[PDB]
Design a protein around this ligand. Sequence first.
Ligand code: NAG
Ligand code: NAG
Ligand code: NAG
Ligand code: NAG
Ligand code: NAG
Ligand code: NAG
Ligand code: NAG
Ligand code: NAG
Ligand code: NAG
Lengths: 168, 168, 168, 325, 325, 325
Amino acid sequence: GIFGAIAGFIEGGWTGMIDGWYGYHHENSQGSGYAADRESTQKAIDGITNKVNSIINKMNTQFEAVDHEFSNLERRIGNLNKRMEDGFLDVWTYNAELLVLLENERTLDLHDANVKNLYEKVKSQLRDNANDLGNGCFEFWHKCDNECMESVKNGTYDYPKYQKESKL
Amino acid sequence: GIFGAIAGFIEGGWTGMIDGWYGYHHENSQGSGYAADRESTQKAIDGITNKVNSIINKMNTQFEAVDHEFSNLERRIGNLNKRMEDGFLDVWTYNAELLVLLENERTLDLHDANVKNLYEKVKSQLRDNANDLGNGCFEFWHKCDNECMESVKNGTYDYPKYQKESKL
Amino acid sequence: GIFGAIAGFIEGGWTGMIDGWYGYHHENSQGSGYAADRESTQKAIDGITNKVNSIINKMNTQFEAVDHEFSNLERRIGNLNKRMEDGFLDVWTYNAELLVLLENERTLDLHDANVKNLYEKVKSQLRDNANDLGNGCFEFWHKCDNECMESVKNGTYDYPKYQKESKL
Amino acid sequence: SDKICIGYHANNSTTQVDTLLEKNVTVTHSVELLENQKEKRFCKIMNKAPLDLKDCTIEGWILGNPKCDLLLGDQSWSYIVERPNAQNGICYPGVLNELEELKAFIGSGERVERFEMFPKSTWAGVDTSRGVTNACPSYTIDSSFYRNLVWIVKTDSATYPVIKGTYNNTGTQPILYFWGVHHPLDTTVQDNLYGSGDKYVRMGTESMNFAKSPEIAARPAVNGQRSRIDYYWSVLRPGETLNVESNGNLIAPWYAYKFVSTNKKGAVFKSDLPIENCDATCQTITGVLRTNKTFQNVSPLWIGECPKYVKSESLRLATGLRNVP
Amino acid sequence: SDKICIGYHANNSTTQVDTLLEKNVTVTHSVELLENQKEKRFCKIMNKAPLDLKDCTIEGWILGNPKCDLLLGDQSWSYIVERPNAQNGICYPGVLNELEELKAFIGSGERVERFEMFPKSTWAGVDTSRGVTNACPSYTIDSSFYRNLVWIVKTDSATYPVIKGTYNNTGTQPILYFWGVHHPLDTTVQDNLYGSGDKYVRMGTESMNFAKSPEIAARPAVNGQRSRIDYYWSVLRPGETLNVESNGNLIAPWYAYKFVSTNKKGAVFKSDLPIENCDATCQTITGVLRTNKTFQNVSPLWIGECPKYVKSESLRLATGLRNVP
Amino acid sequence: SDKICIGYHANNSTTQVDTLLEKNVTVTHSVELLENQKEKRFCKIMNKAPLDLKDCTIEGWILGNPKCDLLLGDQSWSYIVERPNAQNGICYPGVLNELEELKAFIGSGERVERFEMFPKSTWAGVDTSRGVTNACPSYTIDSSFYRNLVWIVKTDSATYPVIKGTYNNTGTQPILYFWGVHHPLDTTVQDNLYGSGDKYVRMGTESMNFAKSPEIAARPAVNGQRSRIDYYWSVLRPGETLNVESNGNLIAPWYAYKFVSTNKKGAVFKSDLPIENCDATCQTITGVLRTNKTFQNVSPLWIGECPKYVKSESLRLATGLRNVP
Ligand SMILES: *C1O[C@H](CO)[C@@H](O)[C@H](O)[C@H]1NC(C)=O
Ligand SMILES: *[C@@H]1O[C@H](CO)[C@@H](O)[C@H](O)[C@H]1NC(C)=O
Ligand SMILES: *[C@@H]1O[C@H](CO)[C@@H](O)[C@H](O)[C@H]1NC(C)=O
Ligand SMILES: *[C@@H]1O[C@H](CO)[C@@H](O)[C@H](O)[C@H]1NC(C)=O
Ligand SMILES: *[C@@H]1O[C@H](CO)[C@@H](O)[C@H](O)[C@H]1NC(C)=O
Ligand SMILES: *[C@@H]1O[C@H](CO)[C@@H](O)[C@H](O)[C@H]1NC(C)=O
Ligand SMILES: *[C@@H]1O[C@H](CO)[C@@H](O)[C@H](O)[C@H]1NC(C)=O
Ligand SMILES: *[C@H]1O[C@H](CO)[C@@H](O)[C@H](O)[C@H]1NC(C)=O
Ligand SMILES: *[C@H]1O[C@H](CO)[C@@H](O)[C@H](O)[C@H]1NC(C)=O
């Protein structure tokens, strides 16, 4: 998907994660479940919202056709008016249609990037204390209780504290 | 090149790889050569094709200038017509020229991203059983026959099976 | 910031680095400082300069309104002229305003990518001979003199040469 | 073994968008920017109702065709609705000069007050009481004439003398008014109605002058008539005066309209849609749009504040991610 | 050591593209979207040939200038080509009224059938057999006249009486027709040709009326003549009738054209390019384009299905990747 | 422990930009593309000064209103400035035909040479030395007339005979010239000035004809006058000749202008701004722009080389990166 994560070396999304756009699935002895990363979710919501509103705002003018009549001795100005009106119509149709195609492409890339960046921040904490697996999951070489999980998510993991158990 | 691969920590392309846009060069005791990754190549072809066709499709209208004459008492409407025609001509010229500059930039990024994502898929399978080298190549710390090579390419490698020899 | 580096797993920029846009802070026994990577800086300058000049060049035409008068029997062509002029004005205002928003977004991504790619080039050389830390810094597990620093920056590091001080 | 994964939201959405690289991508959230729904009626705008011309065209209404009496008098409107099959316009054959500019002038207005500009007593020594024709019936009388004009003929026992009228616009509003010049089919009819001699119609203002003479000829019959009238209109600005002078062939102004030009864009909609008692902020030729959206594909013709018109079927912007459940 | 590497294609391409960040980037594959080549000729379109007016202007053709006889009769055309130095137009000096609208009307057509609208016998008690002039030679006679008009003069021994003609358009096609009013240089010529008295030309339809009188004056000589003719044109719609009435100065309609308006776009090209026997789908004023491309920088004026016109020199889109061999 | 870090530039910039995703992003470097500053004055362009009409309108200047004598003669200009409350235009009431096309024609010029086209001696057997009126004072005399026209009347002791004038344009420059037709308030004034009989004004060129007769009527008083003049203008092309012919009611051309058309764009600015002694390359209706920028929000009306007009307040493009110090 450009950053390579969404559909994906992370093949498939999670219907079970309902509280945000990106985040984490964990499983340990104390149970399993989904939790959204709220900081990167909200930041993306603000970004996309701002995008939508900027497009709306910048497309907030209208060309206005008129329905003036023209006699049979005004074929040239009548046709000039027709060509001008269809002129602006075709310009605005193109601008709207293309903008949507382009922004849609980029909006999917942005989501892809955000997933990828989560993945990389976790990878950087865990090192060899977990095995990658290359599908977005990390099998720990040690035992990771719930505040060990919460530790990974909040960006405070303490590699050394489990470095020993992981070697063995 | 934005994702950093094309020209490049992967300095240089391969004239020897003729069957696709991205892929693999292998060398082992049983020989050497180039093979394209078909799935990412095709997916990119479909993407780029669709982009090209969408641009063509959305540019599939024409503003039409007209041959009409104006008398010496119609300088104002004659000039209005001239300014209108040149008006749309300049709008469409700008749209076409800029779209091409912008899409060309993004198309080169896309290719860069796809190469990068191949690289990262291979890296994730091989681990410390091959030495990176940081130029797109992986020197195996064990011996990799042709179906071991096929294995890497089709996304089925078996890390543990060679963890052995990679030891020394 | 999309590539995730600028503001940032690299939270914060360097007022101390005055000679370019991207680069390195080193500290060792022989001293410390900030040094721009000149190749990636210059390449980005050229890219951005070319972008700016291409926009300027492609916007180098004008629609020209006219001060002609219309009698009280020319309400229809007078209004046609008014709508046409305002028509192009609204088209060019949209094109300029949106192009700026879109390019600004992309220009920031470009800078973000270039920082990220510097980070990844370094990471790929150093491996386990340094500890990441995940904030753009690498603590060496060995002793890195000035020629060793220069070595990292110019892309010639020699992992094996220090592989085994890094052991311990 | 303990595990932590990175991933992304999926849901039950089947809604799709297109991108440059790919068509029909199902996404988790999206927003449609285009309106394609309308109420097929006409409503009030800025709380003013539209004017329904019913079975009259603009020409019939404004000249006072006798079959258009239900429109007679003062009117206020937010826009005008003219029905495509309207039958009552110009009944006595001829051309309304600068017709398209007249239509455009009236469409830029919001109110008219009808008033008597030249009472029949203005014109001395002529007959102001026939001037009635079968080309131009009422619903109740088979032979009549426009309610805003007077077809003057000579009295039976005298010549048609020079006649004169004057009207000083002392108000603050411009006055829209009408006149005509009768062009008989032959010399016999010219002589019956106006007597012999070179006839003229002259009209004048501080800023306009008009002069015309009859052009006698037998033209193809229309509503029974081989004669014609040339109809005319003008606008008497505040502080201006109009002098009328004729010795024959004058279709004289009688009633005219104090005219108030509107504050914004006016419209004349040619449509069969019904008018109802409803308010609106956006009224197109083919219906009302009640929408917050930024685009619409309903119609390029409207008044009020409408979304921009485009030819698209849909303009759906992705907000969420590719849906991979 | 056994080795696997990831990489990308390169090839022998030297073709370059530009991007916002960088000019002259060599890429492995690309597609040019703009056409800049044209065959400098005129070809058939929808396999119907263009009409070549050769040494005639539109005026000369349609009025029937005697030197334009090779065009005389029915014509069918995909477009019209008028040569910039064409010498045969209006031979007897004067103005063709509403000329630009005439040119626009004709350019919206595809066929004319020429036919006799008023035979010379229509006009009783006048001479229809002189009306010939040295301003307007044929290739075979020095003194002639337009083939679609009749210059009527009085007989030697009588007054010019009132003359009348009528034509009922019973067909399904509109009729394009012409007339004139002669304006002599002085009273002597007026009296020689039409006799004394106030002269008039009146023409009438259910929807148009025309009235004019001679305007006598000596103007600068053009093709030997200090007199003038005012030429006119109109369109008699299906189901309409035309009445003509004059007692002098009438250049009468004689032949006219049943006119078929295209439901395509029509064109009149002013150009010196040659017409050849070739087919085309896209014909510009400066030549044919044979192309599947979506843009072109050849000309904004065309008929058929052409690419969009832009001022660019090249619009090359990258499809492949940066070429680094 | 030894350390190497990757990082990026920051600085003291507080300058912000907007992006699609985020407003008010402070960046290290940026460039503003839009100009919003103007010198509120008029300057020379291509080192030619503008023509200041001061207390005259275009009409007063070009017809020669006696109160516009400070403009009289040759003029060269880069553009024209007409002041909104200019008081001296048409002094003797009436309409200048095709006024808007006249204004456009003049705006497309850069120079005029005034010259005597028909000396008063052209017109035999008439009085060329009254033709003076209180509607049209000089600064010096209460009763005068346009300096480029001659109001001809009959001599006291004779009828107004046919008069004739001719002018052959043997130069390389087109000539802009004026005439009129007097329309008296009544038959008494017609007879006093021109005597009895059907009067006419005829003008003719190889390519234009004009014919008009007086239209007598009493119109509302303007500058004391219930009579009118219809004023006209035309352009005598190089190699063309003009014949004038009248037996009454002619306001004759006297002085005219050799006219040189610019092959730039010309302009007529309606403004109260002062003209000063300065050069400029870009002059808008509301002031001069001194700028290398590519956009501006000052005015859509200009001459010279100006940036593209847009409605934006600012168009700031990021060049550097997000500033995080
Ligand atoms: C690219 O630059 C070359 C010179 O290096 C120039 O001749 C050529 O015209 C340029 N290409 C395009 C597509 O403009
Ligand atoms: C889809 O999901 C929503 C909640 O997210 C639920 O309310 C709705 O019923 C679902 N649709 C179907 C068809 O089950
Ligand atoms: C480039 O390559 C193709 C096939 O790979 C070859 O046929 C073609 O001739 C080559 N072009 C040149 C200029 O050699
Ligand atoms: C023209 O012809 C048709 C039938 O041939 C007839 O109905 C119509 O009355 C005619 N009109 C005139 C004016 O002769
Ligand atoms: C900011 O630094 C610049 C040099 O880049 C210096 O010239 C300027 O005076 C400084 N301004 C402020 C407000 O610190
Ligand atoms: C105008 O002048 C030229 C000579 O300069 C002459 O040949 C031509 O006959 C003149 N035109 C008229 C109408 O006399
Ligand atoms: C119209 O009336 C006003 C005010 O009563 C007056 O000053 C003006 O002279 C009048 N004009 C005419 C022509 O009667
Ligand atoms: C996408 O394709 C579907 C069929 O899968 C088609 O019916 C639909 O109209 C398309 N949607 C859009 C938004 O173009
Ligand atoms: C950004 O917001 C600031 C408030 O800090 C405001 O003054 C300004 O309108 C915005 N910037 C621009 C360039 O408009």
